[PDB]
Structure formats: structure tokens, C-alpha cells
Write the C-alpha cells for this entry.
Amino acid sequence: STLTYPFHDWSQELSPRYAQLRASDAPVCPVVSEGTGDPLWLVTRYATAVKLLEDSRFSSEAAQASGAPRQEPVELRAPGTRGDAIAMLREAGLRSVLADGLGPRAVRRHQGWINDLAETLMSELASREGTFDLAADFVEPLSSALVSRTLLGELSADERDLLAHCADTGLRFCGVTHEEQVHAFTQMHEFFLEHARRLAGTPGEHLLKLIAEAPVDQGPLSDEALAEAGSLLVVAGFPTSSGFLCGALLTLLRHPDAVQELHAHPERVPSAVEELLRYTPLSTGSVKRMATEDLEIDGVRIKAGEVVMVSLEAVNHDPDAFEDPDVFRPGREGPMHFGFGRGRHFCPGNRLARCVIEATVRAVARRPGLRLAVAPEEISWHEGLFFRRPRAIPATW
Ligand code: HEM
Ligand SMILES: [Br-]
Ligand SMILES: [Br-]
Ligand SMILES: [Cl-]
Ligand SMILES: [Cl-]
Ligand SMILES: [Cl-]
Ligand SMILES: [Cl-]
Ligand code: NA
């Protein structure tokens, strides 16, 4: 194939290429990685994505082994490490602890201060005269608090900035040198080699503490393994939450009549949270799986070792699954969205994510009149990030 991937759609306007692919006859389409030249397959239709992501012979772990074709310009790991940290934790027998640190018990522990913080932040903005920046003044402190209090432990401001910077530098398709990307993973790993044990020991019930204290049959977790967990929690939790919350705010500010309904009918907020997860695009790339044997999906042969990608954004905008997919329609009763993926790799951060998204939507819904202070086309976007994010969101009442 000569069609290079990704499609350079760094703003909320999805590349028209996704619709062209969806409308093609084949359910799986060949592309080539811009960053590596590797051949890849790409799925954009909901019905095919379901079959792929629910078939465990298309392996997520195997899409990382050395030699695997990939979309990313560099491997998403510090050199010399395993980089399969979620598998390593599950292998060590910690699914129990992961459920306790990320599941409904964690939401019950944290939802109180998350909603308090969202309201405090929004209230401070409501008290200002003039304009403010919802990215710097709302999303950054809320997402930083989520990561510190629920995942990593008490971070200094400088530590928070280092991790934010490593995530933004390493999780990119372009904009920096390959060497700079690899070094961002190395810097993050070296940080947690030195400090993860200390962070696991700070006050709170954050996940890194729960992992460090848990019983493991093969003897407690080592320094390298705790450091691998740290890097995982940054890459999985920080740029996703910050990018999504920024994008969701832009969606809410562009749909005032939706917000006025939520203001009038607070019980409708959960439905709007689910529609944001469908409608708001986050990743500029795709989830990936490697065929572990010769496989055939909807009639296309995939050879052992080939990698198949699913664009969650394309699937969430598939008109065969959603009527009027490019309309923001809370309470549309269609199928489940793909914002958190599908099947056995469904985002385990989904409970905490929904908590922070719900808190954000309610903070907005309680205060009608919030609007962009510039036109949407004047919003400036970070170009090349895996997780789309605006540079600023100028806003006002
Ligand atoms: C902020 C909004 C978030 C969104 C939209 C999001 C989205 C996703 C998606 C789509 C996947 C599936 C990847 C795949 O199929 O290969 C995923 C996986 C994952 N997410 Fe999230 N995520 C978010 C936040 C978080 C948070 C806060 C955490 C941790 C606290 C987290 C931890 C993980 C982990 C560990 C995985 C890998 C699971 C596996 O491969 O089995 N995510 N996330
Ligand atoms: Br846009
Ligand atoms: Br629908
Ligand atoms: Cl899990
Ligand atoms: Cl879990
Ligand atoms: Cl509970
Ligand atoms: Cl007030
Ligand atoms: Na380079």
C-alpha cells in the first residue's frame, strides 16, 4: 500500500480518509506506517471492529514483541525494558488489586473530592471578570489531581511537569526527533526507578501504593516492575484524561442547547457522558492487535504476524452503527461506543475516567452561559500528539 498512516487529523475534524475507507468494499484495508514504513491493516467499520477486538487470537501483547510492525515511530517503552506492564501485573496475580484501585470501590473513595475540585475550579473561573483558559485553569489541575491522588501518589509540581512533558514528547507521530521520543521514555523510567518506591509510600490510597503492598506469589514486586507500572499509569492516564477533558469541554461549549437540557435535567448527564465518549475524538492513531495464527476476518486473510489496527474514532462515527453519527445527541439509543475500546482490553481506567468526565459535565451544566471566547477555527492544536489536545481553550461567561 501507498496510503500512509496516520492521517494528520490533529484537530477535532476527522480525516475524510476514514469515511472513504469505511465506504470501501473491503472490511480491512492495507496502509503503511509513515514513521516506520511497516505494512499494517486498518479497520474502520463497527461491525468488523467488534469481531476483531473480541477475538483473542488477535493479540494486544503480541503487537509489541520485538520485530512487530507498528504505527508509532518508536517503541512505547524505555530501551531494555519489557513495556508490557499491564500484562506483567496481571501475570503476577494482581487483577484483584487493580479492581480495588480502579473499580467501583475506588470511585466511591474518590468521587467526593473530584466533584469538590471540579466545582472549586469552575467557581474560581466564574468569579473572574473577563476571559480565562479552560485547559490551563480547569483541565490541567483536575487531570493532574486525578493522576496524583488516584494513581501515583503525591507529586511535586516539577515532577508533574516532567511526567506531563515525557508523555507529550514520547506519545507522538511527529513534531520531535525519534531520538527525543526514546529519551522521553528513558527519562520517565529513570524517574520511577529512583522514586516509585517513595511514591508508593506517600499518604493516600493511590494505585501505586496498592500494587507495592500487595502479596505476589513470586515474591514482592521489584524496583524495575514498580517503575514499569509507574510509566504505564502516566502514559495510560495523563494525556488521555487531559486530552479527552479538553475535547469534551469544546464539544459542550459548541452545543449550548444540549447544555441547557442538562441544566434542566441533571439525570440526563450520564447519557451525555456516554455520548461525549462516542462523539469526542481522542486518539489520532488506532488500537492494534497482531494475528497469532493465519486468520480470516469478514473474508480477508490476515497472515500470522501481521498487525491489524482499529480506529476507535472511525468506528464511533460509523453511520451503519449510529444514525447521524456526526451529530452530538445525548440519549441517542444506539450500540455501545468504542471510546474505551472493547472486549478483554476495555479500558480499566474507565470508572475513574467516567467519574471525572461526569464531574466536569455537571460543573458546566450548573453554570449556563459558558462559551468560547474565540471561534472554533481559531483554537490552536498540538500537532502530532497521539491524544489530541488544544494548546488553549479561551472561554468566558
Ligand atoms: C481519560 C480517558 C481515557 C480514555 C478515553 C481511555 C481509553 C482507553 C482505551 C480505548 C483503551 C483500550 C486500548 C486497546 O484496546 O489496546 C485503554 C486501555 C487502557 N487504559 Fe485507558 N483511557 C482513559 C483513561 C485511563 C486511565 C485514567 C487509566 C488508569 C487510571 C487508564 C488505564 C488503561 C490501561 C492500563 C489500559 C490497557 C488495558 C489492556 O491493554 O488490557 N486509562 N484506555
Ligand atoms: Br476543531
Ligand atoms: Br443511534
Ligand atoms: Cl485489570
Ligand atoms: Cl481492573
Ligand atoms: Cl464500596
Ligand atoms: Cl457562584
Ligand atoms: Na528523527
In short: The chain has one domain: 1-397.
